[PDB]
Ligand binder design. Structure first.
Ligand SMILES: Nc1ncnc2c1ncn2[C@@H]1O[C@H](COP(=O)(O)OP(=O)(O)NP(=O)(O)O)[C@@H](O)[C@H]1O
Length: 297
């Protein structure tokens, strides 16, 4: 059949009565917990703690959107109290973590793994926008929200802010949330989200993969550096040298032209004009080889 009906308790224990040394982090609608299941499976679970109904959309999503580069929901928990969402635990955690951390001294993401990540994730997003009945606007595209499987393939996760369109091509009016780093200018400006605001987010996601930096960082301010990742990088055209901009942890890897390629893509996706941004399928194409050299003026 599919779609697992769970009973709070039989997942309090799976989370070892939940809290404490089981917190992968404070989520968007509560907290994320790593538990097991009776048979064996590592799951991560979302717990809610106090309008919304944001829950029921994340639940019947499964029934409208499935794809190997999209986190598949394992199951949920209702209860006339608070509610829960259970996704597979992801072997290698977020792209954020793998860049932001790591533990003891675990290794960094090499450049070709970063290229795969950009590709799969765009593939997952392209599918959301183009091959789903109501189109699905994700609304939280960022490195923290791209998860990695055991083979380090990207899966797009956390569908907390996802919206179902229809409403033709444009527009989904709804209040601005997420963090400052990944919000499109028109979005904050006009309170409207759309596929092109995902594109912007995805293009900032790439800047993170390439630089290793957060999108909005006071530590850069602590210097004479831009608080805004995009701004910082555009310290490219001027001050020559990727080198300084490219993630220090890479040294060994990448060929100049490799990175320049991804950057152009990131740049194309974060243009202030939504109309000139690529569609994600165009993005995939370019990651796939088709039509980047001329995409710009
Ligand atoms: N299925 C999963 N497997 C492994 N780790 C997960 C899973 N789901 C979420 N996480 C982790 O939960 C931690 C918190 O992420 P999350 O709280 O969902 O993002 P967020 O709070 O909404 N945005 P941000 O503040 O930028 O982290 C992350 O560091 C993820 O690594």
């Amino acid at each position: 059949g599919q779609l697992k009906r769970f009973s709070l308790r039989e997942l309090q224990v799976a989370s070892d009565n939940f809290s404490n040394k089981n917190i992968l982090g404070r989520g968007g609608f509560g907290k994320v917990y790593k538990g097991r299941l009776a048979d064996g499976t590592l799951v991560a679970v979302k717990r809610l703690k106090e309008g919304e109904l944001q829950f029921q959309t994340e639940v019947e999503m499964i029934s409208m959107a499935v794809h190997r580069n999209l986190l598949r929901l394992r199951g949920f928990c209702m209860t006339p109290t608070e509610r829960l969402l259970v996704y597979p635990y992801m072997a290698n955690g977020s792209v954020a973590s793998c860049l932001r951390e790591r533990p003891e001294s675990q290794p960094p993401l090499d450049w070709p793994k970063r290229q795969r990540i950009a590709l799969g994730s765009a593939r997952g997003l392209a599918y959301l926008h183009d091959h789903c009945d109501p189109k699905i606007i994700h609304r939280d595209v960022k490195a923290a929200n791209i998860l990695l499987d055991e083979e380090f393939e990207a899966v797009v996760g956390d569908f907390g802010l996802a919206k179902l369109m229809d409403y033709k091509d444009t527009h989904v009016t709804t209040a601005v949330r997420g963090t400052i780093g990944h919000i499109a200018p028109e979005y904050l400006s006009t309170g409207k989200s759309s596929e092109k605001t995902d594109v912007f987010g995805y293009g900032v996601m790439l800047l993170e993969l390439i630089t290793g930096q957060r999108a909005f960082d006071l530590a850069r301010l602590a210097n004479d550096d831009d608080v805004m990742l995009l701004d910082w990088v555009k310290g490219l055209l001027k001050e020559k040298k990727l080198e300084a901009l490219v993630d220090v942890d890479l040294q060994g890897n990448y060929k100049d032209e490799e990175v320049e390629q991804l950057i152009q893509v990131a740049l194309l996706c974060t243009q202030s004009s939504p109309m000139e941004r690529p569609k994600m399928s165009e993005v995939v194409r370019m990651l796939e080889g088709d039509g980047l050299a001329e995409r710009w003026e």
